[PDB]
Design a protein around this ligand. Structure first.
Ligand SMILES: Nc1ncnc2c1ncn2[C@@H]1O[C@H](COP(=O)(O)OP(=O)(O)NP(=O)(O)O)[C@@H](O)[C@H]1O
Ligand SMILES: Nc1ncnc2c1ncn2[C@@H]1O[C@H](COP(=O)(O)OP(=O)(O)NP(=O)(O)O)[C@@H](O)[C@H]1O
Ligand SMILES: [Mg+2]
Ligand SMILES: [Mg+2]
Lengths: 578, 584
């Protein structure tokens, strides 16, 4: 139940669009009720002839009534479609936009554990389900009931109470058989959807690892592992479509038994002198015009049922994946002095394995602090917690003495600029990626960042320059070039706090020192936290934080830590060993 | 087109199965259904026996039995035969869809590295889905919607010829010709809008998927609304195109209805006039009524059938264009296998660039000796990973050649060449599975002993042991739940499980502390005897103890020699090593 979302629609002229559309339907249905009465002009072709002329009433009245009735029915249906198409496309678009936004609202844990193909299939299928569900609720529930009741009333009036009882019995057995077969088919369809999602997810995962498959020559292995899920889906789909065919034959059996009974009773009434032969075609046309909407209601029920289950699936994917949230009436972060404080932070990604065991440190405002440690000590975890992708179990994190968990995430992330360990670029040009740092960045800012990131000369020597396409995830650039593009993005952003998580690992020391010296020259009060395994990158830092066993082991300058003969001294001795 | 003549050799292996029986049965079912549909109004035309020869006990027997037997049972048998065709053909159809999807996936993995580097994942996904669906529906309509419609059309024409002379048949063929004409005209009117619409849909989905891949980036720069707007733009463009297309379809439907109902009025008016002259009966009225409805019901879909066949043909031609253009490396005719007796590597005057407007390798020549441990260093952009990609033959050089044990890489099967190489790439990507599956991926059917030995060699065995789920820990998409060093060590473990004669580490230990790195390297040097090891690294301490160091600068080999030799020459490597020992 997500009701209030469509209510803004009446702000527009959608009223005028929907009412007329509904109006069209009604008029079309009206002609469909005046179509068999139009066909009892054959009575005037046999019984009593014509009041004025026997063949003139029949010819003229019949051509006009039957032809215009069928044409006007189709015309009103298509007029409804034509006038409602704009509203329908706008509704589908708004649903897709809101789904996309809610998908970007989800937590980092979800996107790290996601499967892109599965998410794609689930989103597509659920959006189609919701769209068709709303369409059927607007155009296939009230008109069908109207036709059903109207045709029942006409049979009541012109044929007593036998035809209506037979018709309601047929309709009730129809809805019962439909429910039974649909409930039988729900399991197969659910399994089929799940298998299709898994198959598409596996295919997309194989696409993401194309270079891996090439590196290990496992093309046939991936082909077979996709064919497995493909064949499972094929079996499930065969079962489901056979179920649908059986439902169709049962529905046809019921409707045609009603047909035989009705026309037999009508001709028996004729043979008893009660009814006319025109009543035969009367009941014929009315039963066909009643068989169309019941065939519509069967698929309407099936579609609403599976649309509800697919909607539940998609929402279950977009529901419970929001860990970090703003506290009620959260204020904005005020960065007067860009300091960072880790106050006894205890954190782990999952409760069964703890990574940070009460970590505490103080990055002074405007300082240039480094973070070292072995692989797995939890440095990138510090980076992720500072950006509040997760909340710590115990302790807290402060920026200028303010708890990040008690401030709006927007203001917190506006004060931070992160160059991640895994740098990912948009499948666009270098200019777009570098300008992405700030919305509406000027060419001057882009050039300044490219010069500060030591890629201005690289971009200048490129045949397409700033318009060079970087490919998916920027893999068409070299590693150092991608890292420098990320640095240029964060420089365009220009926040008070900067965090380089292994930002220059793919750079030669010369280019790295160019970037760092340019930053130290042009920056005045920027705080710069840097993580690196290459100790030469951070030797000239103001302070170095040695992380060990999820805690802070040592802290101090390069010379102090070397003289203290501690853990950092061992690192630098083993790395500076000739 | 000739694409269908070129595509047909693949539906030729399909002919060898029992699916001959299933398709024959399906066609038979169709034919029986059409026969019953034709016979339906023949005996609904026993309303004549109701009025004419009527008013007694015998007429009521003729009529009751006549309609009960023929009309009700006939329409039921028609629907039953339609669904019987569906049920007997469902297996063949699903198998055809599955085989098409498998072949599309295989060909997609057959394309060149350039394509996948420049690809758009969401666009590729949407295009593959739409094209496979279109080809499937095209084949389905060619098999089940061409012969039955022609049969019904000609049969109803013959029946009208017999029971109504030659005026009705001429009117009917005129209506049919104006119907197909209007359909073609409107379809070609909307085709451009449909192509633009499909293109916009693909672009929008590609943009959304790219935003998904950059979730962390969007979060880092707070551009959620920016991505929302950049997706909404293409979404509403697609919406406008779709509105235009569906309105075109609505006009097509009203025009078809106009034609059909004009023919209806004319035919039934002529029938009642013939009745008024004593020529025809009221049964002829109901006759022509049911026959005209049963004749224009299949045409109500051939309009879309033409659209579907056209778009399926163009998508098939697009597929053939994509496979005739996006495979740049191929095996020479009767290519032999690579015989690596002595794992040496040779770059003989290699001139290469990715695009012709920018050359990266300017006549590079070097000799990696068999069993040696050579390093490749240089500034960012010199073309070291380019050397790595050329050695694996992702691209072919413009000039020069590459040799492994004296054999030209371009004159050997790619499978044997790539089997002799094991590379840890600069961009390590893992499958969205467990650590055990990723490490075991190095060799098909690797044993637990090999996986454990490789995890020990990559210095990650202890880490996996201390994990709550051990080898079954999920690494996430692209292995982003592991750390950088852990992911690199998993990649090293993969290449160690593979255990080829030649190994290439392109920045393989950059995210590792020097201790773990030296553990891995010492373990390798201990267990390896005659393995050739090419290593690329900016951190020179990783490669200082190499047998030879190759300095690459702007695509040319500048210096060459041991660590001591290059340090003593006071050249570029000496400058790099002095600047890297910063002692600040
Ligand atoms: N999302 C996650 N789920 C589970 N475990 C995780 C997740 N992210 C990180 N880890 C683990 O947490 C530990 C610390 O990771 P991380 O903070 O990246 O350390 P790191 O040392 O700074 N990166 P590195 O230099 O490459 O070793 C490692 O054992 C990771 O495998
Ligand atoms: N597919 C491609 N299309 C265009 N340019 C490319 C492509 N691949 C690589 N390049 C360029 O080729 C040059 C060198 O690429 P690369 O082989 O990665 O050198 P590299 O030595 O590995 N750089 P790095 O790893 O950062 O130290 C760079 O200018 C790249 O941008
Ligand atoms: Mg890290
Ligand atoms: Mg590289």
């Amino acid at each position: 139940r997500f009701l209030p979302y469509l209510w803004p629609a009446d702000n527009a002229v959608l009223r005028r669009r929907v009412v007329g559309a509904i109006l069209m339907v009604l008029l079309g249905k009206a002609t469909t009720l005046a179509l068999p009465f139009a066909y009892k002009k054959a009575v005037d072709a046999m019984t009593l002839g014509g009041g004025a002329q026997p063949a003139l009433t029949v010819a003229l009245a019949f051509v006009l009534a039957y032809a215009l009735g069928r044409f006007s029915g189709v015309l009103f249906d298509n007029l409804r479609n034509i006038v409602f198409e704009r509203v329908g496309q706008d509704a589908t678009r708004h649903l897709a936009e809101n789904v996309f936004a809610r998908l970007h609202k989800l937590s980092l844990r979800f996107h790290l554990a996601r499967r892109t193909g599965e998410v794609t299939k689930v989103i597509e299928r659920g959006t189609k389900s919701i769209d068709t569900m709303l369409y059927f609720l607007l155009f296939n529930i009230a008109p069908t009931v109207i036709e059903l009741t109207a045709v029942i009333v006409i049979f009541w009036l012109n044929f007593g109470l036998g035809l209506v009882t037979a018709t309601i019995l047929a309709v009730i057995a129809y809805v019962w058989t439909t429910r039974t077969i649909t409930e039988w088919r729900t399991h197969l369809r659910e399994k089929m959807n799940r298998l299709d999602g898994q198959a598409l997810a596996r295919a997309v995962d194989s696409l993401l690892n194309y270079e891996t498959v090439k590196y290990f020559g496992a093309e046939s292995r991936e082909e077979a592992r996709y064919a497995s899920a493909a064949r499972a889906y094929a079996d499930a789909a065969v079962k489901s479509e056979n179920s649908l065919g059986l439902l169709n034959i049962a529905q046809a059996l019921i409707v045609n038994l009603l047909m035989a009974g009705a026309m037999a009773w009508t001709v028996y009434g004729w043979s008893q002198g009660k009814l006319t032969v025109g009543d035969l075609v009367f009941v014929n046309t009315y039963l066909t015009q009643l068989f169309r909407p019941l065939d519509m209601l069967g698929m309407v029920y099936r579609t609403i049922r599976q649309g509800l289950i697919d909607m539940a699936e998609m929402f279950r994917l977009i529901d419970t994946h929001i860990e970090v949230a703003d506290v009620p009436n959260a204020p904005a972060l005020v960065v007067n002095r860009p300091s960072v404080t880790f106050d006894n932070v205890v954190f782990g990604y999952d409760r069964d394995r703890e990574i940070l065991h009460g970590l505490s440190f103080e990055v002074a405002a405007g300082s240039r602090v480094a973070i070292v440690g072995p692989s797995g000590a939890g440095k990138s975890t510090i980076a992720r917690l500072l950006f509040r992708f997760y909340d710590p179990w115990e302790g807290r994190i402060l920026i200028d003495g303010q708890d990040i968990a008690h401030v709006t995430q927007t203001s917190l992330r506006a004060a931070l600029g992160i160059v991640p360990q895994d740098s990912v670029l948009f499948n666009d040009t270098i200019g777009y990626n570098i300008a992405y740092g700030r919305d509406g960045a000027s060419r001057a800012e882009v050039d300044a960042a490219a010069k500060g990131a030591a890629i201005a000369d690289f971009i200048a020597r490129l045949p397409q320059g700033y318009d060079t396409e970087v490919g998916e995830r920027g893999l068409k650039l070299s590693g150092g070039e991608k890292q420098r593009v990320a640095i240029a993005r964060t420089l365009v952003k220009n926040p008070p706090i900067l965090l380089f998580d292994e930002a220059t690992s793919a750079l030669d020391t010369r280019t790295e020192q160019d970037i760092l010296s340019t930053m130290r020259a042009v920056a005045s009060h920027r705080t710069t936290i840097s993580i690196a395994h290459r100790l030469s990158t951070i030797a000239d830092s103001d302070t170095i934080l040695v992380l060990d066993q999820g805690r802070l082991a040592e802290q101090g300058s390069h010379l102090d830590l070397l003289r203290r003969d501690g853990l950092y001294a061992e690192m630098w001795a083993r790395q500076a060993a000739e």
